[PDB]
Amino acid sequence: MVKIATRKYLGKQNVYDIGVERDHNFALKNGFIASACAFHPQALSYETEILTVEYGLLPIGKIVEKRIECTVYSVDNNGNIYTQPVAQWHDRGEQEVFEYCLEDGSLIRATKDHKFMTVDGQMLPIDEIFERELDLMRVDNLPNH
Amino acid sequence: MVKIATRKYLGKQNVYDIGVERDHNFALKNGFIASACAFHPQALSYETEILTVEYGLLPIGKIVEKRIECTVYSVDNNGNIYTQPVAQWHDRGEQEVFEYCLEDGSLIRATKDHKFMTVDGQMLPIDEIFERELDLMRVDNLPNH
């Protein structure tokens, strides 16, 4: 449950995404929930850290550029957590990156259309989350080591 | 434009979805483009017809319940039509289904949040397409053979 304070432009950069099965989402650092499936090339900046079972936190750009075989954390619609491997490693070309600074000092850098999960369980575009001043789901009880 | 004229409740019925490897969409009879990925169980009614290379039009309920290995049609982000195999067969249980009747009499029977492609290339829930009077994408010259 964290709100997005600011949104600042970070330039055009090569951006990335991953695909998984199940609920088509994966956990970022500290428990935010990004979507893992889309028609449009929704993407995240290179440095965006993803929590993995094997190696801990890794930047998605490293996971994709090196096609690292690893397992990420997902959430169901009940709210309970589970693991599943990365299935697709997406290089989404050059797109405009925007830096969303959260109320808690966290940074999410991504395309405006990348969907993230609100507290209610809605998968809404990050830019829509920011302007409607909605709360980002932040999952607790992820492993911390 | 290809717009939905009416929305009618059909009740709870057994519903179905399929998954594909890339793009995450597939063509229905009459050229509507249905999304193949979402956080929530979004699904189609049994008799919803999917165009396949090898069998022609097949009910999605038959595809899922007999695990029919077939090849569907999908659109990429540049508008190109291509074929790819079904990768996942999803029995989505019993859900509420609505009949969406298009201006020309074409029907779509789905759960209200099932995503479909609009003429500009967005994937939006069919309920929002109906309510905001959006123009569905409809592809032609798909080999119905």
DSSP string spanning A14-52? EEEEEE-STTSEEEBGGGBEEE---SS---B-TT-EEEE
Q: What is the resolution of this structure in A?
A: 2.0
Q: What is the spatial distance between Cα A118 and Cα A125, in angstroms, rounded to a whole number?
A: 10
User: Which chain A residues in 25-84 lie under 8 Å from chain B, judged by CB atoms?
Assistant: 25, 35, 37-41, 77
What 3-state DSSP class applies to B65?
helix
Closest approach of A9 to chain B, Cα-based (Å)? 23
Closest approach of A24 to chain B, Cα-based (Å)? 6
What 3-state DSSP class applies to A54?
coil
Sheet bearing A25-27, strands edge to edge = A25-27, A33-35, A115-117, A123-125
DSSP state of A118: B
Question: Are B51 and B72 contacting, i.e. CB atoms less than 8 angstroms apart?
Answer: yes
**C-alpha pair distances (Å), B68 with each of A50, B17, B51, B87, B117:** 36, 13, 13, 10, 25
Question: Are B9 and B111 contacting, i.e. CB atoms less than 8 angstroms apart?
Answer: no
Q: What is the spatial distance between Cα B79 and Cα A82, in angstroms, rounded to a whole number?
A: 36
Closest approach of B59 to chain A, Cα-based (Å)? 23
Question: Are A73 and A55 contacting, i.e. CB atoms less than 8 angstroms apart?
Answer: no
DSSP state of A143: -
Residue in chain A closest to B24 (alpha carbons) equals: A39
Is A121's Cβ below 8 Å from some Cβ in B? yes
Comparing C-alpha atoms, which of B131, B94, B102 is closest to residue B11?
B94
**Exposed, middle or buried, B78 (CB in 10 Å: 0-12/13-18/19+)?**
exposed
Identify the residue whose tokens are 């053979």: B145
Q: What is the spatial distance between Cα A120 and Cα A130, in angstroms, rounded to a whole number?
A: 15
Experimental approach? X-ray
The domains of chain B are located at: 1-145
Comparing C-alpha atoms, which of B114, B39, B79, B130 is closest to residue A40?
B79
Residue in chain A closest to B35 (alpha carbons) equals: A39
Around B60, how many Cα atoms within 13 Å sit in the side-chain half-sphere? 29
Residue in chain B closest to A74 (alpha carbons) equals: B39
Q: What is the spatial distance between Cα A6 and Cα B102, in angstroms, rounded to a whole number?
A: 42
DSSP state of B121: S
Chain mean position to CA B27: 6
Identify the residue whose tokens are 């609920």: A23
Around B26, how many Cα atoms within 13 Å sit in the side-chain half-sphere? 29
Q: What is the 3-state secondary structure (H, E, C) of B18-64?
A: EEECCCCEEEEHHHEEEECCCCCCCCEECCCEEEECCCEEEEHHHHH
Identify the residue whose tokens are 């993995």: A52
